Design a protein around this ligand. Structure first.
Ligand SMILES: Nc1nc2c(ncn2[C@@H]2O[C@H](COP(=O)(O)OP(=O)(O)OP(=O)(O)O)[C@@H](O)[C@H]2O)c(=O)[nH]1
Ligand SMILES: Nc1nc2c(ncn2[C@@H]2O[C@H](COP(=O)(O)OP(=O)(O)O)[C@@H](O)[C@H]2O)c(=O)[nH]1
Ligand SMILES: Nc1nc2c(ncn2[C@@H]2O[C@H](COP(=O)(O)OP(=O)(O)O)[C@@H](O)[C@H]2O)c(=O)[nH]1
Ligand SMILES: [Mg+2]
Lengths: 41, 430, 54, 21, 55, 50, 430, 432
């Protein structure tokens, strides 16, 4: 065991949630542009 | 009918809004109790735009005062116009942010966002048809810079169609009061460009200059700027509250001021600023107001507009005048300063008139203007951010909250592509 | 029933708890409660004096 | 002070006053 | 732009019901008029396909 | 921001979704569907239907 | 000589009785004790002491509604043998008011109706008012019409009713009562006048400038309807119209007896001060969809029969001029088999006004009774709300536990679905 | 007429009903001695619903107070309105339950239930047409949680058709004062679901939260809690006791509020609660009443309905109004918060109007709601009961009473079937 383990665990979960958020943002952008096109039609 | 819900964030936002709630109480003839003591019927016909009704002929502001530090609102509630605010509309936390944008936007703001969303939902449903919201805050703080960006981030999806003006405070480079100012500035302007129908950039230096030269005040207190700030804020919605020869409102300016949705940053101005050595020698004429306005010393932003091109110009006149001197002066200012206006939009100037003058005065004028010279401010902040971000200094405050690093990289990307598109609109062939 | 639709019938209304002594402040109406203790400060102070002397 | 005049049944009780006689 | 051109959800349990009346003199003319209202479906306003149509 | 995502993506979410996808492009490749993830089979089927 | 006995059922029935019978006393001159200080004979009845007794049967399953009448202004007006109460109510249960508590008072209400009937010499019809929402107004009212049919085979049974509103609702389990009641309103009724409360709410706010109405404002307007229908019976006119006359020229088929009423002009005294009243304007407002008291648009259907009821200083020439104008209008539709679909009635006496009422007094008026096919879509909505809840058997345990089987639920829904298909054949043009 | 008999169980029940009886005596103008003192004639028109006649123009409450511990009866008798209760109606035992549901339900309650049944049968045969019984008790006690359930089980057999209300005080897990509290709660919720027409779940922690936030009382004792409960119980039957534009009563509410017999747990709410400072800046209006009620902070149960689906909503208003604004507000809150309501019931809100406002107050509104958020309490109670019952902890106290061990299992099975059924109804699309 090591002293900053609790702090280290925080940074790992932080990067995990950040990566998931960026992927979800990408998918949402795709869907929104599709909304724009279908509304125009 | 066309109501306004007044947002209020940060210590800076707290004091100017308190001053702003003071002056429009004076205009509407509202005592510190809350009752109406005015004389004219025209002082109480459209008072519902800012106030809400309370029992006993009482008028309470439709305001939401937000701050993370408990100390500020005690000064708010201890002022002369201190007790008019509803105690429930006060919302606050137990700890501040300590000049960290990250604390107010990610860690501490996320607890209090629930409470403010109810009380703004409260003030949304009270009015039958809300014209829109309006926010006052500072980009160099911890809460208004932080949580304040989170409030406008949420109400857009929930309330899309409503207008959102921001009475923001841009920090200054020549005098600065916070070391980590460049970070919170850039982590806010990336938010601002994406949710704001129209932005007013108020910088603390230019009023501090305007108090020396134009008004000749020996000891400028913070209240004097809060008067001068709120003075121009009154001139924005004056045509909304009172009838005039040519009526207007926020939206009549908003669609007329924004040629592209990426451009909503203007530079305000207020006309009747005279020292006590000037009042005995002046004739109150519209030509004097127009020449006072288009002078570059009068402004409360920090970018000389002669370095850029005026995209659009808005002038709101307060009082009863003839339309000849009006229509003939913007035509006169348009043709003489032909080099300072873009060529692809003829008649760049838009005008509105409210017949009712402000109290204690005869004539007045308010100017809103989007010019290319406002890009001189944003690049100067990026001149400091990269100079400090390149050495990864002070970062442990920000990455300690758990954020990644691409947030910085995308934040500088947004402003760089903002000024890049801002620059292209300066050199355009007909 | 003009008072129902009257624009200024509200001016003829009352907060119902204007003072601590209003006769309508009966516990049937829920504007005055036993939990409100305006004697709190004096009770604390005379507790302090009692304990101090003891 | 715990007053048990009401709780005490009629047998096994004295002539102590109950409430509201 | 809002587009609401649908009909109330109906359980099919009792969906197959005729009417207790026979007004038209013969079922042949009945079929003619029913073909008529079948084509008038789209132009006629209202969910039940009755009333004035459009202009 | 929901816009510079597309602009950096390039290939991903090509404007006019009916326009055919570029066969090879440096843009971020479409992630596989997953019941628990950023990309879902349901949103993929919605995109195809649109 | 013509006489109409009122059989009001439910809290609506008692409250419509207070408004209607208050109006009947004023138009004849009856003091609150019951003494004039023989147009009255169709409503009142002479006694030994020169006292006039209304021919009404107030019935309710809960005491407090009727007890207010027992202690009201008109306490000594109604014979104390004309206001029936009951210990326990149905509590929004058609089933309870139809098989358990309803039967307990069935004999006694019929006895009171019997003793009021033999008093009358030539009995004209029965005006029966109730509601589809409450249990007593739906359950017991279903039984009395069912038992009035076997007692009185030929006497007309008009049916003024409260159709539950398609948007607002005073009860949740109301469509169960409303669906089951329509059997009685189909094979045990002769004509119907369903009106929903929100439609009058729209009328009162828009025209009468009462932004905060109550049931009383609703009740006074409905009282004007019943007065206008029977005004020919009470007072002489140029073209008098009895109940049987306008019943015949409104119902083409035995399963189509649901006309929609319309009253005009309904306008505040301030607004009538400057706008002229003539036969043309008051008859055009009768065809305005915003003035219908059923939340359906006749422009979504076609009229098969229209009953005209003119009151005031009307002239027959202006009546025929108005009828000629309305026929020459494309937005008004008509079925093919009814080239002539008008029945006009002319009365001399202008409508009286209750002091402190809401309508402005006017020298001329008009009542409209139109049987259209656009009503059927409202029954489709009463389906749909009855629809999305019978699938899960919600609230049925109340009905089954009361003591009625569940097979009638399918049959009750089935008949109205076929009854909807009835109006489909009406709407088709050969 | 339409009478109500008030059953009282436990210290919770006794104090709550003392406050309730005092409050409704203030509404009907009844002194501590017993006679009538009011001014209006409507103040004495339907007082026979709760009061019984005695010579001298005197009225006695229709209350039956039951407790296994005699020391609470002295405090009740020495309370403010201690005179008004006829002391034959007091039924007390000599030994309490010691917070033991089993002792309250089997061992000692069997010797007092005959006397309680005799008292309530006398009181039921007194009135000619009894609407039903209304019981106040606590679920974390030994007598109310215990012997009260046995009383309910017998009187449901005796008078099946009469209405059965319970203003039950459910325990709170966040603030608890009894270790064996989950055992009693689990063993009594089964009796509640089997034999009860309507329940109102009242949480002391929720009342404390309301006093701390809404009213900002420096020292809100149990008296203010009982004050709030009394507000709720008075607002339930105010329209029964006093005439209004749209009348209602207990069965009017129950028939419209219970879609299925297993679903009779309700969340009650009371609108006009403001602090002394908030009295300065306010306006007595129907929109403000509607908003204040529909805020989840006003709720006096221990669950957030934003995490549930409102099956059905009940609003009973007190005071003279315009019905336009109340119907507009209920339709607006239905439309705006559309998906918090289930889709298989239209117009989920039922409204009632009583003309007479509560004394000294112009305007008020009360609320009864059946929602899916109420299963959140049962899940937590089940969790704690599992955590205790795994190790057979505290089991000898209940086992020495003679009962077997399958009863805990069957009670847990019933509660789990309840929560599963509520969740199934929550996740239920209708196809049409
Ligand atoms: N237009 C109008 N409708 C009323 C009035 N009073 C009651 N109603 C209607 O009656 C319905 C409820 O039934 P009630 O008449 O109140 O009671 P009920 O018919 O005796 O049936 P129970 O409630 O079971 O006793 C409500 O939905 C109202 O729409 C009134 O004064 N005017
Ligand atoms: N012009 C003006 N600036 C103000 C006022 N009050 C505070 N400020 C500025 O606001 C900055 C501090 O903001 P801060 O309190 O940290 O914002 P917060 O963290 O969001 O509460 C300082 O640079 C001040 O110059 C005011 O009344 N007027
Ligand atoms: N809200 C409220 N709760 C109370 C009051 N008095 C007691 N309680 C609660 O009731 C519980 C004790 O009930 P108890 O006397 O054991 O009931 P019994 O066993 O049936 O007599 C405690 O958990 C208290 O929190 C009161 O006045 N108000
Ligand atoms: Mg009723």
């Amino acid at each position: 065991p090591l002293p900053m383990h609790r702090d280290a665990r925080a940074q790992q979960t932080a990067e995990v949630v950040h990566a998931h958020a960026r992927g979800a943002r990408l998918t949402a952008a795709r869907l929104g542009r599709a909304q724009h096109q279908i509304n125009g039609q | 009918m066309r109501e306004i819900v007044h947002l209020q964030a940060g210590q800076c936002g707290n004091q100017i809004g308190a001053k702003f709630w003071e002056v429009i109480s004076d205009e509407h003839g509202i005592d510190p109790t809350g009752t109406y003591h005015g004389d004219s019927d025209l002082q109480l016909e459209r008072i519902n735009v800012y106030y809400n009704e309370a029992t006993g002929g009482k008028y309470v502001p439709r305001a939401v005062l937000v701050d993370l530090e408990p100390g500020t609102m005690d000064s708010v509630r201890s002022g002369p116009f201190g007790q008019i605010f509803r105690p429930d509309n006060f919302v606050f936390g137990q700890s501040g942010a300590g000049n960290n944008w990250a604390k107010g936007h990610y860690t501490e703001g996320a607890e209090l966002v629930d409470s403010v969303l109810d009380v703004v939902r409260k003030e949304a449903e009270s009015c039958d048809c809300l014209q829109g919201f309006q926010l006052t805050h500072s980009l160099g703080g911890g809460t208004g810079s932080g949580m304040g960006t989170l409030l406008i981030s949420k109400i857009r999806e929930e309330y899309p169609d409503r207008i959102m003006n921001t009475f923001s405070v841009v920090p200054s480079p020549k005098v600065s009061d916070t070391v980590v100012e460049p970070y919170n500035a850039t982590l806010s302007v990336h938010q601002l460009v994406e949710n704001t129908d129209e932005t007013y950039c108020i910088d603390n230096e230019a009023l501090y200059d305007i108090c020396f030269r134009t008004l000749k005040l020996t000891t400028p207190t913070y209240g004097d700027l809060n008067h001068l700030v709120s003075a121009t804020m009154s001139g924005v919605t004056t045509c909304l509250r009172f009838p005039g020869q040519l009526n207007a409102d926020l939206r009549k300016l908003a669609v007329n001021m924004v040629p592209f949705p990426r451009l909503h940053f203007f530079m305000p101005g207020f006309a009747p600023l005279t020292s006590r050595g000037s009042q005995q020698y002046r004739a109150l004429t519209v030509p004097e107001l127009t020449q006072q306005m288009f002078d570059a010393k009068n402004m409360m932003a920090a970018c000389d507009p002669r370095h850029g091109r005026y995209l659009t110009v808005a002038a709101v006149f307060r009082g009863r005048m003839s339309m000849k001197e009006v229509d003939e002066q913007m035509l006169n200012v348009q043709n003489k300063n032909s080099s300072y206006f873009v060529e692809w939009i003829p008649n760049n100037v838009k005008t509105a008139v409210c017949d009712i003058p402000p109290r204690g005065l005869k004539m007045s004028a308010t100017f809103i203007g989007n010019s290319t010279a406002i890009q001189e401010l944003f690049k100067r902040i990026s001149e400091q951010f990269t100079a400090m971000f390149r050495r990864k200094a002070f970062l442990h405050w920000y990455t300690g909250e758990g954020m990644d690093e691409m947030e910085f990289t995308e934040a500088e990307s947004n402003m760089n592509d903002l000024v890049s598109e801002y620059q292209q609109y300066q050199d355009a062939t007909a | 029933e003009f008072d129902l639709s009257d624009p200024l019938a509200l001016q003829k209304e009352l907060p119902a708890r204007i003072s601590d002594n209003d006769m309508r402040n009966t516990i049937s109406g829920m504007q005055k409660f036993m939990g409100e203790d305006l004697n709190f400060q004096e009770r604390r102070r005379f507790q302090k004096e009692q304990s101090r002397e003891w | 002070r715990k007053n048990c005049s009401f709780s005490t049944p009629v047998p096994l009780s004295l002539g102590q006053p109950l409430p509201y006689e | 732009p809002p587009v609401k051109l649908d009909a109330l959800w109906h359980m099919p349990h009792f969906k197959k019901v005729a009417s207790h009346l026979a007004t038209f003199p013969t079922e042949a003319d009945r079929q003619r008029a029913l073909k008529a209202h079948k084509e008038e479906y789209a132009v006629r306003q209202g969910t039940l396909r009755m009333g004035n149509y459009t202009h | 921001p929901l816009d510079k995502v597309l602009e950096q993506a390039g290939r991903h979410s090509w404007v006019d979704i009916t326009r055919p996808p570029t066969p090879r492009t440096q843009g971020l490749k479409t992630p596989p569907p997953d019941p628990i993830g950023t990309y879902t089979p349901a949103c993929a089927k919605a995109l195809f239907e649109a | 000589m013509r006489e109409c006995i009122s059989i009001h059922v439910g809290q609506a029935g008692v409250q419509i009785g207070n408004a209607c019978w208050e109006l009947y006393c004023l138009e004849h001159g009856i003091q609150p004790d019951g003494q004039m200080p023989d147009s009255f004979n169709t409503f009142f009845s002479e006694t030994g002491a020169g006292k006039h007794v209304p021919r009404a049967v107030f019935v309710d399953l809960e005491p407090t509604v009727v007890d207010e009448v027992r202690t009201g202004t008109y306490r000594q007006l109604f014979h104390p043998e004309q206001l029936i109460t009951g210990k326990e109510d149905a509590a929004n249960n058609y089933a309870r008011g139809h098989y358990t508590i309803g039967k307990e008072i069935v004999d006694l209400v019929l006895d009171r109706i019997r003793k009021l009937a033999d008093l009358c010499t030539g009995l004209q019809g029965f005006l029966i008012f109730h509601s589809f929402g409450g249990g007593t107004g739906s359950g017991f009212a279903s039984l009395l019409m069912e038992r009035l049919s076997v007692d009185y085979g030929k006497k007309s049974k008009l049916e003024f009713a409260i159709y539950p509103a398609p948007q607002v609702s005073t009860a949740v389990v109301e469509p169960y009562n409303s669906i089951l009641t329509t059997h009685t309103t189909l094979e045990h009724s002769d004509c119907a006048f369903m009106v929903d409360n929100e439609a009058i709410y729209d009328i009162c706010r828009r025209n009468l400038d009462i932004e905060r109405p109550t049931y009383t404002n609703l009740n006074r307007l409905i009282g004007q309807i019943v007065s206008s229908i029977t005004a020919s019976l009470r007072f002489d006119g140029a073209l008098n119209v009895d109940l049987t006359e306008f019943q015949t020229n409104l119902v083409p088929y035995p399963r189509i007896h649901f006309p929609l009423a319309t009253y005009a002009p309904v306008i505040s005294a301030e607004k009538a001060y400057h706008e002229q009243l003539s036969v043309a304007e008051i008859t055009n407002a009768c065809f305005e969809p915003a003035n219908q008291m059923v939340k359906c648009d006749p422009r979504h259907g076609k009229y098969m029969a229209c009953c005209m009821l003119y009151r005031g200083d009307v002239v027959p020439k202006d009546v025929n001029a108005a009828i000629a104008t309305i026929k020459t209008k494309r937005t008004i539709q008509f079925v093919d088999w009814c080239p002539t679909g008008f029945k006009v009635g002319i009365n001399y006496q202008p409508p009286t006004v209750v002091p402190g009422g809401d309508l402005a007094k006017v020298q001329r008026a008009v009542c409209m009774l139109s049987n259209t096919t656009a009503i059927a879509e409202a029954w489709a909505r009463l389906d749909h709300k009855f629809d999305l809840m019978y699938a899960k058997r919600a609230f049925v345990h109340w009905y089954v536990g009361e003591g009625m089987e569940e097979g009638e639920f399918s049959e009750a829904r089935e008949d109205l679905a076929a009854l909807e298909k009835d109006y489909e054949e009406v709407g088709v043009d050969s």
